[PDB]
Amino acid sequence: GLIVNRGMEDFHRMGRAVQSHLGYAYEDRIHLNTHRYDPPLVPRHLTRGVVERTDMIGTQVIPLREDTARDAARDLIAADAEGIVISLLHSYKNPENERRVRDIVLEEVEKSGKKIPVFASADYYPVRKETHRTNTTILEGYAAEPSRQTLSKISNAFKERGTKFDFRVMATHGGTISWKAKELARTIVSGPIGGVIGAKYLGEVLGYKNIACSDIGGTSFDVALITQGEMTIKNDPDMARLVLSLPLVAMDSVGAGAGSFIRLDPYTRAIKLGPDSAGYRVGVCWKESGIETVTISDCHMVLGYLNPDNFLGGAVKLDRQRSVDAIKAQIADPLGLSVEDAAAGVIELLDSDLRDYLRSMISGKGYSPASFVCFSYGGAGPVHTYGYTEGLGFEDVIVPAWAAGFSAFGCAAADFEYRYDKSLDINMPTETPDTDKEKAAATLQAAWEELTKNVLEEFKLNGYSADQVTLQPGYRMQYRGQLNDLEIESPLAQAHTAADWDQLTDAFNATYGRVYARSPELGYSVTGAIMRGMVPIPKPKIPKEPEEGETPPESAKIGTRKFYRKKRWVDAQLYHMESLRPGNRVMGPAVIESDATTFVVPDGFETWLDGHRLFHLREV
Amino acid sequence: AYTRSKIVDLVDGKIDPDTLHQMLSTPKDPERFVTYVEILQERMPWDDKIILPLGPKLFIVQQKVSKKWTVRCECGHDFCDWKDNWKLSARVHVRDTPQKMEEIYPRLMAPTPSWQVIREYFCPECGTLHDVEAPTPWYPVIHDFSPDIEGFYQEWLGLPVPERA
Amino acid sequence: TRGIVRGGETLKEHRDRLMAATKATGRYAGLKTLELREREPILYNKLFSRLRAGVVDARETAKKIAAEGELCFTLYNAAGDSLLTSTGIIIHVGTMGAAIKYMIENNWEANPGVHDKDIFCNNDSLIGNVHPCDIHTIVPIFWEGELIGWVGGVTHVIDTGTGQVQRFGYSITCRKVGANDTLFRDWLHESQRMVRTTRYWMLDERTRIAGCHMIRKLVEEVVAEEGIEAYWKFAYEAVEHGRLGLQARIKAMTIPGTYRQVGFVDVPYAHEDVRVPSDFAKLDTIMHAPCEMTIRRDGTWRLDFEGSSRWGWHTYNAHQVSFTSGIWVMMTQTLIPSEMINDGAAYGTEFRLPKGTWMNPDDRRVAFSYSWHFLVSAWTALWRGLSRSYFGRGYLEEVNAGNANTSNWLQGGGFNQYDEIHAVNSFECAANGTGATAVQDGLSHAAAIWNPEGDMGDMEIWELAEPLVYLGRQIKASSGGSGKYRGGCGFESLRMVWNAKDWTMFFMGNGHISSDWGLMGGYPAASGYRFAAHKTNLKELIASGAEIPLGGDTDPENPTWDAMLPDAQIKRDKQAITTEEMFSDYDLYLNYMRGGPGFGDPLDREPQAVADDINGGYVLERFAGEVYGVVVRKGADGQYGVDEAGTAAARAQIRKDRLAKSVPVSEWMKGEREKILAKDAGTQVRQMFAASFKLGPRFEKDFRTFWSLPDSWTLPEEEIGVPTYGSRYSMDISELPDVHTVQFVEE
Amino acid sequence: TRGIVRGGETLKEHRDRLMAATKATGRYAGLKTLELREREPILYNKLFSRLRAGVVDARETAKKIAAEGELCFTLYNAAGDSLLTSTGIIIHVGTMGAAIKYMIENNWEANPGVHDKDIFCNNDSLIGNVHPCDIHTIVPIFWEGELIGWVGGVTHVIDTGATGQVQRYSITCRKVGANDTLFRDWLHESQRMVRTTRYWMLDERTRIAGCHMIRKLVEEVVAEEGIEA
Ligand SMILES: Nc1ncnc2c1ncn2[C@@H]1O[C@H](COP(=O)(O)O)[C@@H](O)[C@H]1O
Ligand SMILES: [Mn+2]
Ligand SMILES: [Mn+2]
Ligand SMILES: [Zn+2]
């Protein structure tokens, strides 16, 4: 159920209008008739309203009329609501009214004798934007407990086969939490944000502050930047076609993976990739899969990048001839090209799309690739690493030997970290009396304390006491008028004095200049307080082998295959990836194969393997 | 192409969202028209060949005997020659007063009859509402569509033009 | 080379050649073959992909300067023709394209000259622009000393400079505002006086120049890697490519023939609450936008607006550039939803806008500050026309009855809760109802015609910008057009003035007339009305615990708020357009967004959809039986359910009532003809026809023929009894010497 | 000498000096004595009588470019202070002088730069002007690459635009020409502010013609009687 302000019962089901076209590709976004509303999380007949209004600064324009809160509660109870969510406007600023309604609801629930949980948005996600907040708070009263059952089973399936531990789950903010945490809406993340946490994890170990991550999968092309050791967070994302209030590790989708379909527009004859992908079914090279439209994977077959007999270690029987036939009919003949030049052409377009997106993405942060290192992972990453890194000037291009599971490796490398956020609106001229700076610190400090309670309560239910939890206070600050994408780790555990405030402003000017053209004159704003709490846990150990000769063992050679590139067929030396030793060099043309990965190294390229089993791709 | 049963559900508004999104976002199937008219033909109480639908229950038909093309309602009423405007041979009800307007709109939300009028054009036989105009007073009756059936069948669909008298 | 274009042609010699080849062959630049595209398919596809991707990156990277709107960027070839446009609203592709074509035809090359690293700015009224506040930044692209194209960037400034009626109430004519990538100081000081707030204008200029220079570098890098030989072909093949794309889409989705439709909207300037200073401007008028759409076998098509009404003393007129350039934001939502959209589509479409009409006034006094009011009311009819082609061909998924009037534009002025100038309005009319489909209902509160990515905004964000508080936000019951499938419903919000000083507000939207029509049996969306309450005494009502207005105006025929405010001055009428009016704290303002038209016979709608609509607040119970013929019964759970047997009898009874109350069209016609002969109609109707006749002879002939009127019958506008200033004496643009405007339209 | 004013001072440095001397001494430019007037009276009376006559000549001569009285021309020193004014209504001596002092205070010298043969135009409301339709043309006078004064020409244009106005066409010292040639974008843009083109175009040709006549006058006087004097 849902209780909101009287007269605004509809704002949830209206989805702010935007939810009728979230997750659409460009052509669908403008194609009006494609727009569609999903059913509301809470239906109208389970939504009620209380008479009350609190303005933007907490002023109570319309005092709460408590009898309207009792009747609202009684109605949802009579309708047998399995959960009651409360979300009043500006409750993040002054939760007095929303928490009073909460207490009223709890009272009326007691009188009924029914077990009905109550969720006040100011207690779960006290942040701006009522549609983002209410959606996120509803997920707790709608999908939390059912998902605990779901993951209780997953964790049980492993327990009854050997495991002696409690599973952790990934959360939007990059940290991992318990599957029975108080707030599980943060586990709605499904994308490969682990890849960003993994790269950042390796960066700390190898001294790589600036990393450009590229996760090339079978269903998605995902990219992200780690700049000066820190990654970008999106604070008002949209997921499941819902606007939400969850801090999310920022990644940009660039395509639909190696399974992306290749078509020719019927009106334009333009080569079109995706937006849909064959995903698991690889492509038309898999007869038993029923795919009838060629994919990027089929192009890899024609060009000879992939091994037909060694797809997933030979579990998938692929027939290259089907790729040659389907590309001839669908792409090559319509364009007047050979099957090779067509497949090669597609790969050429894809490489330039990824190349441009990385270059612009780095350029948008104020850097050049020369300051950055590129991590190319994912099953298909190593297949294109040469292509979309050519001539960008990356300080170093790296392909982890465990690229196929780098995203899963990152979920293990993440911290056992809970995070809680709250909105603020501190406005501070550059020059104010210490009185005003003390009040500013008091506002931010009071937020840090309310958040610390939430963080530590999450850990206590997990068996950890406060003395075991490491608290990292944070906040979102900016120059008045200038939005930014920075989050500041507070240098102080708490703040009270006007000198502690100056220490927080300086902490921002330091991080800002460290990542980037400052403007400290306009003053400072604090739009949100952050609290993070971490507990030590076992993290995946990085290999650290001693490097040997630079000639790979002859046992690592596993035949030759011909692949087509630059209008030329070339005989490539095949290698067994895990047979290669640290120190070994591999001259192009070559194809270093694993059971779930293929690292291509055309002529004009070279790669060497280091003690950490990381491949370094160079342009000789 | 799309299965016939899938196109039937499109005609009935029972189509599912996934396929409806596919139809909108993927290349149009050229065989749509032939399948479309064949479905409609199978649900008419008469066997006169449809050559172009003009509305949910309004078509340009080929009279079986005379081979003359006429506009016809689903119930079977012929309005006129396919070149003429069927509305000129129909029945109309004009809402030119606040009383009439307030039967279909709430007051204040209703158009003001001295500025805009509602013209409801019906079939004289079954009373089906085939089209509603909302012009000003005095405004002529609108001839909505004059299709070039010959060029349509011949040049675009690659079909023979039906016989005509 | 003498001229500055690559090859040695002047900008005008170059364009004149391409335009001559376009006329003689019917193909842009006389490109009977696209050698690059045919001979080098990959390089051609890569050129679009990189240029499109780089143009979007410029738009999004430059956008990141906020505290998206009309923001957009377009890449043009040397002749001023669009190749690629960024994400965003593309209504300014032609306005900026016209600005380039104005410099070409007025020998800017010679004076003030077009040099590398120059910066031009423009918003000219006579060149063509949607809004006066839509500022263009245009930068020329040079390669090895020769010009190869242009870049255009546009923004909608929100704080520039009551009851305008004549144009002489700002104008920038392709002014050189900078050189060597450096802006001139006299321009910076001058343009900051054209504005009430400085922050918005200044950042917007940075953004436009940023995106432009990014795109300029983007081209210099593409041309460097792929060569100028390749790019030079692409800069003209891509346009002829767009034309072929539109032609192929027409032949594939539509039907050849002639489609005839018309649209209307009211301009009630006689009401006392429209405080215009010119007394000759105070009269009721109606917009008349007839359209004869001709789709041809060769895949070309023609939009002829013969018979339209004259321009009027108000701000709802348009420009032929504004009309044709902006019509594609609608077309790309149904016929050509493509990221390749460029001027090629324009060269595949014929527009006839008769000179002197509201869409092609050719008079320098004309104002156009709020063109949307007419534009959205005229374009909707084209949805219905195209839908007839989709419906007959069988592509019912594409059918759409039309777009709602993008109306009630909440506008306010004064000092906000921060004791500062008001600049940001709510803009909830971005989420109106949409037209019904031949397959399903329309989307409620979902989109506007000039932006299908409708976003309603969060209430908590608007209350940080406006000195207003939400007392309600609710779906507008019975606002969607009735039909077998219901048109999308609008929505409404009740605002209370809170911590405002020197505050004023006015209403803006259709009132007496519904601009959209239903399709093939469907009805039009609800029309607009106004609600505002002053001297409410709400502070004392809130404190005392008395009844207070909340939610939306559910049934304005039976309102509940008015009685709660006995001491209030309540304005509740159909005056959907007003001039600035004084408001103060605790006053009320109803923001009502319109719904979309419906589709099909209402009593063919499935009864459960009617019951679901009542329970959902989309239809007032009253009309369940009168409009749809569905008998509903309230149950224990309070939900309405269908009465199967009772519905069947009601539907069968309505059908007999229809045949009874109806009349043969032949009979009704002779009665309407008597009224026409007696000239029996309001002045607004007669003025509309009288003015439409003079500007549209072909329309007057059809009118006279249809009604069998004798030549003795005449409808001179001068004998209606209303002001007629501007009907016989004009201020043509031809009076201006040394000014060469370009004709994109037949007239 | 970097500053464009004679001696090397910038426009602002120059005026700032003279204004500080005025505030301190109670005498304009700190002139406790008038050496030229007292030691060379004939030459002093000759410069005034001749400049006054040449300015009047420019006003009456330019007047024959239409057919007013609000037409007027003024000669300023480098600091924007009036020396002489033609026949006509003298309301605009201060308004135009204020336009000159605006360019001085807002660093027009660096951007868009004040060069010889440059043409400026002004009617700004915030700088201060009698009517919105009273248009100013300001030309700088140079001698041997250094600025020694300004010329201002004004006309009341009868056919501009803009009703029952209640709250507030603004030209803020815009450089509308260089090399004594007007910019096309300025000419086109100006023909949209006016109802009829004739009056606006002749008035500008009048203002410029008079400004250039006065510029030639100064150059001729300076040449014959010396720049020192
Ligand atoms: N030996 C391989 N076996 C299976 N998939 C591979 C192999 N090499 C590359 N792939 C690519 O990696 C993709 C899967 O990556 P991912 O989605 O990260 O699991 C496939 O769709 C292929 O494009
Ligand atoms: Mn605009
Ligand atoms: Mn004057
Ligand atoms: Zn019938």
Numbering used by the authors:
A (entry chain E): 95 to 610, 614 to 717
B (entry chain F): 2 to 166
C (entry chain D): 14 to 80, 87 to 180, 189 to 196, 199 to 776
D (entry chain A): 14 to 80, 87 to 181, 189 to 194, 199 to 259
Question: What's in the article?
Answer:
The AMP-bound structure exhibits dramatic rearrangements of the β-subunits relative to the ligand-free state, with a Cα RMSD difference of 6.3 Å, while the α- and γ-subunits remain almost the same with Cα RMSD of 1.3 Å and 0.3 Å, respectively. First, in the AMP-bound enzyme, the displacement (11–18 Å) of several amino acid residues that participate in nucleotide interactions leads to closing of the substrate-access channel. Most notably, β-Phe405 is displaced by 16 Å, to a new position where it interacts with the adenine of AMP through π-stacking, capping off the access channel. β-Ser391 and the helix of which it is a part rotate into hydrogen bonding distance with the ribosyl moiety. Second, a new internal channel opens up in the AMP-bound structure, connecting the nucleotide-binding site and the Mn site where acetone carboxylation occurs. The Mn-proximal α-helix concurrently forms a disordered loop (α-81–87), allowing the opening of the substrate channel and the bidentate coordination of the α-Glu89 carboxylate to Mn. The Mn in this structure appears to be coordinately saturated, with α-His150 and α-His175 as monodentate ligands and two side chains each bound in a bidentate mode (α-Asp153, α-Glu89). The structure of AC in the presence of bound AMP and in the absence of these phosphorylated intermediates may therefore represent a trapped state, bound to the product AMP but lacking intermediates needed to proceed further in the reaction. This trapped state reveals the internal channel that is proposed to protect the semistable phosphorylated intermediates from the bulk solvent as they travel from the nucleotide-binding site to the Mn site.
ACs contain metal ions but not organic cofactors, and use ATP to activate substrates through phosphorylation. Like many carboxylases, AC is a heteromultimeric enzyme complex. Its architecture consists of two heterotrimeric αβγ subunits joined by the interacting α-subunits to form a dimeric core.
